[PDB]
Design a binder for this molecule. Structure first.
Ligand code: QQC
Length: 300
């Protein structure tokens, strides 16, 4: 009480943050592109500014935790935290991050197929695995790994973002049981997350297998995980029946298909990530090494 937690409220002052455009609303919050121009000389730096969509007390608390998580991370494949803006006369919070111009990897793969080949896909796979290795060192579980939640800086560099669902593992357990569930990205969830609300490094590995599928399906649209799973379940189904069917499918070895053109060896990596036995899933370190060995073993 006596002394409140450290904050640097003069680092990004709201009067010097100029709104340019909204970049989106989604699972990532409401994010705007702004320019931070403290010298008011139409110089400065374009930044990404994350805001809450519903500023309830609970969401503000969760936002503080997300900010602390992001502040703690420094890695080439993690979107760079810049600071916080205590806007509305220091009665609101906005999160300041670096701006990456190409947006989500999901959108980049659709918009920029002219510059994507399997070599690039494996480079992105490697980078995502290394960022996830780094999260593991902090006992952080991302819980929303998907190409929509990875940003593209340029054709040679991707970075995880969207730490809005990230949790920190209890000191003495290897999983976090989420006991307030909200909207769930069910088609990326491991079976134990669907059936027991249990999240772990190994459930992030399951989701990474879905990301790897997404990368290798990029040539098509009918092939996204939601579309393919709904085709398998039955496109007519609605509501909880969808989840019931997805659980039953996954528990009895139902899986997304090998994308057209995908090497057998890459599909094998996906399949090994999609193991119902949590402990048999590979680690992010196993995956990074295997993917980089595959890359290195090509001719040249
Ligand atoms: C934190 C951050 C975001 C960022 N850049 C972009 C760029 C783009 C691409 N726009 C650019 C302007 O013209 C049209 C194409 C974009 N589209 C959306 C929906 C988002 C929002 C977003 C998506 C995924 C994730 Cl993980 C986090 C997000 F905040 N963004 N965010 N840099 N840093």
């Amino acid at each position: 009480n006596l002394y409140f937690q450290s904050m640097d409220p003069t680092q990004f002052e709201e009067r010097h943050l100029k709104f340019l455009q909204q970049l989106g609303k989604g699972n990532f919050g409401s994010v705007e592109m702004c320019r931070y121009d403290p010298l008011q000389d139409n110089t400065g730096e374009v930044v990404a500014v994350k805001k809450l969509q519903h500023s309830t007390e609970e969401h503000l608390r969760d936002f503080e935790r997300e900010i602390e998580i992001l502040k703690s991370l420094q890695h080439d494949n993690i979107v760079k935290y810049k600071g916080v803006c205590y806007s509305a006369g220091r009665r609101n919070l906005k999160l300041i991050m670096e701006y990456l111009p190409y947006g989500s990897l999901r959108d980049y793969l659709q918009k920029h197929k002219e510059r994507i080949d399997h070599i690039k896909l494996l480079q992105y796979t490697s980078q995502i695995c290394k960022g996830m290795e780094y999260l593991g060192t902090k006992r952080y579980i991302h819980r929303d790994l998907a190409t929509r939640n990875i940003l593209v800086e340029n054709e040679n560099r991707v970075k995880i973002g969207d730490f809005g669902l990230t949790k920190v593992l209890p000191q003495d357990k290897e999983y976090y049981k989420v006991k307030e569930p909200g909207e769930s990205p069910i088609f990326w969830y491991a079976p134990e997350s669907l059936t027991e609300s249990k999240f772990s490094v190994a459930s992030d590995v399951w989701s990474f297998g879905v990301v790897l599928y997404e990368l290798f399906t990029y040539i098509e649209k009918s092939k996204s995980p939601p579309a393919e799973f709904m085709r398998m379940i039955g496109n007519d189904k609605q509501g909880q029946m969808i989840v019931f069917h997805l659980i039953e499918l996954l528990k009895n070895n139902g899986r997304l298909p090998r994308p057209d053109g995908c090497p057998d060896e890459i599909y094998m990596i996906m399949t090994e990530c999609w193991n119902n036995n949590v402990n048999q899933r590979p680690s992010f370190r196993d995956l990074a090494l295997r993917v980089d060995q595959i890359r290195d073993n090509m001719a040249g």
